[PDB]
Design a protein around this ligand. Sequence first.
Ligand SMILES: *[C@@H]1O[C@H](CO)[C@H](O)[C@H](O[C@@H]2O[C@H](CO)[C@@H](O[C@@H]3O[C@H](CS(=O)(=O)O)[C@H](O)[C@H](O[C@H]4O[C@H](CO[C@H]5O[C@H](CO)[C@@H](O)[C@H](O)[C@@H]5O)[C@@H](O)[C@H](O[C@H]5O[C@H](CO)[C@@H](O)[C@H](O)[C@@H]5O)[C@@H]4O)[C@H]3O[C@@H]3O[C@H]([C@H](O)CO)[C@H](O)[C@H](O)[C@H]3O)[C@H](O)[C@H]2O)[C@H]1O
Ligand SMILES: *[C@@H]1O[C@H](CO)[C@H](O)[C@H](O[C@@H]2O[C@H](CO)[C@@H](O[C@@H]3O[C@H](CS(=O)(=O)O)[C@H](O)[C@H](O[C@H]4O[C@H](CO[C@H]5O[C@H](CO)[C@@H](O)[C@H](O)[C@@H]5O)[C@@H](O)[C@H](O[C@H]5O[C@H](CO)[C@@H](O)[C@H](O)[C@@H]5O)[C@@H]4O)[C@H]3O[C@@H]3O[C@H]([C@H](O)CO)[C@H](O)[C@H](O)[C@H]3O)[C@H](O)[C@H]2O)[C@H]1O
Ligand SMILES: *[C@@H]1O[C@H](CO)[C@H](O)[C@H](O[C@@H]2O[C@H](CO)[C@@H](O[C@@H]3O[C@H](CS(=O)(=O)O)[C@H](O)[C@H](O[C@H]4O[C@H](CO[C@H]5O[C@H](CO)[C@@H](O)[C@H](O)[C@@H]5O)[C@@H](O)[C@H](O[C@H]5O[C@H](CO)[C@@H](O)[C@H](O)[C@@H]5O)[C@@H]4O)[C@H]3O[C@@H]3O[C@H]([C@H](O)CO)[C@H](O)[C@H](O)[C@H]3O)[C@H](O)[C@H]2O)[C@H]1O
Lengths: 68, 68
Amino acid sequence: VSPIIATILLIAITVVLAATLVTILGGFTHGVSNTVETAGVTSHITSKYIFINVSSSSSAISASSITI
Amino acid sequence: VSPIIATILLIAITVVLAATLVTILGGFTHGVSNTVETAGVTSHITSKYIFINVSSSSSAISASSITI
Ligand SMILES: *[C@@H]1O[C@H](CO)[C@H](O)[C@H](O[C@@H]2O[C@H](CO)[C@@H](O[C@@H]3O[C@H](CS(=O)(=O)O)[C@H](O)[C@H](O[C@H]4O[C@H](CO[C@H]5O[C@H](CO)[C@@H](O)[C@H](O)[C@@H]5O)[C@@H](O)[C@H](O[C@H]5O[C@H](CO)[C@@H](O)[C@H](O)[C@@H]5O)[C@@H]4O)[C@H]3O[C@@H]3O[C@H]([C@H](O)CO)[C@H](O)[C@H](O)[C@H]3O)[C@H](O)[C@H]2O)[C@H]1O
Ligand SMILES: *[C@@H]1O[C@H](CO)[C@H](O)[C@H](O[C@@H]2O[C@H](CO)[C@@H](O[C@@H]3O[C@H](CS(=O)(=O)O)[C@H](O)[C@H](O[C@H]4O[C@H](CO[C@H]5O[C@H](CO)[C@@H](O)[C@H](O)[C@@H]5O)[C@@H](O)[C@H](O[C@H]5O[C@H](CO)[C@@H](O)[C@H](O)[C@@H]5O)[C@@H]4O)[C@H]3O[C@@H]3O[C@H]([C@H](O)CO)[C@H](O)[C@H](O)[C@H]3O)[C@H](O)[C@H]2O)[C@H]1O
Ligand SMILES: *[C@@H]1O[C@H](CO)[C@H](O)[C@H](O[C@@H]2O[C@H](CO)[C@@H](O[C@@H]3O[C@H](CS(=O)(=O)O)[C@H](O)[C@H](O[C@H]4O[C@H](CO[C@H]5O[C@H](CO)[C@@H](O)[C@H](O)[C@@H]5O)[C@@H](O)[C@H](O[C@H]5O[C@H](CO)[C@@H](O)[C@H](O)[C@@H]5O)[C@@H]4O)[C@H]3O[C@@H]3O[C@H]([C@H](O)CO)[C@H](O)[C@H](O)[C@H]3O)[C@H](O)[C@H]2O)[C@H]1O
């Protein structure tokens, strides 16, 4: 009798460890993305205005997505 | 007499536990397979057509097996 019952208990424990491990991995598998951008930019500054002129960029992006 | 009869009953019980355990294991030993695929794909979109051009793939697969 007892060696089979001990085996059933060890299967029950194994499932909870595997379920625990899955929640540990979730802290690694997020928030990685390609954020690199590169632009040819020239600028001139005066007592009233900053002028900014763009010559090229790595990608086309919205002017609302850029913070100054 | 009675210690031998008690032993015969415990053998009968043991077989039913082993048969029970075998049906528990069957829930683990299925549905695991190598499903990973990886392709070099490029695409262009227009008001009438999507164009899709493939440069390489990890394996050769039927175009009917892919869902869009
Ligand atoms: C990005 O890409 C763009 C597009 O290609 C440009 O190439 C940019 O390069 C910059 O461009 C700006 C704008 O052209 C340049 O700013 C000028 O800088 C010159 C100096 S410079 O040595 O001549 O080269 C001038 O300062 C010029 O100003 C003009 O306007 C002045 C103000 O006149 C305004 O207001 C009056 C009312 O008071 C209006 O009647 C008039 O219509 C106008 O709206 C004038 O005083 C000035 O006269 C004298 O200026 C200088 C001395 O400061 C002198 O050296 C000159 O010979 C001249 O005698 C001149 O007529 C600048 O132009 C901008 O004008 C705006 C104005 O709102 C009109 O848009 C601002 O008010 C400023 O005056 C000024 O920013 C800059 O130098 C370039 O780098 C690329 O970076
Ligand atoms: C999962 O997988 C999916 C599918 O692949 C996506 O990839 C998803 O990624 C997310 O997608 C959503 C939806 O595309 C993104 O939410 C958008 O976020 C952008 C910000 S961003 O910087 O431009 O990238 C915008 O906020 C955008 O909102 C649009 O709609 C706004 C509201 O317009 C709605 O209502 C008006 C009436 O008032 C209608 O006329 C119109 O048709 C529409 O229904 C606009 O204001 C907005 O304009 C400006 O928005 C931002 C500032 O907020 C600015 O930066 C922009 O440049 C632009 O000038 C823009 O047009 C979001 O889209 C969703 O739109 C719904 C709307 O119901 C339509 O479905 C909501 O109302 C919200 O507006 C918004 O959720 C999200 O960023 C992605 O992560 C993957 O995760
Ligand atoms: C156990 O171990 C064995 C041995 O190793 C296997 O590995 C087994 O795995 C299963 O194997 C079976 C048999 O190979 C697989 O069933 C096939 O499934 C595919 C789908 S798949 O995405 O391509 O992978 C197909 O459905 C295939 O069917 C073929 O046959 C169809 C019917 O053709 C029959 O009838 C015509 C007359 O109408 C005859 O001319 C012809 O000779 C043949 O007898 C075709 O329609 C089918 O074409 C298209 O099928 C699919 C769409 O359904 C599409 O995706 C394909 O790209 C293709 O364009 C294809 O040619 C299945 O094979 C079995 O064929 C028998 C037939 O009797 C011949 O034996 C049946 O009639 C069924 O058609 C089908 O069961 C199964 O997927 C595997 O899991 C291990 O489990």
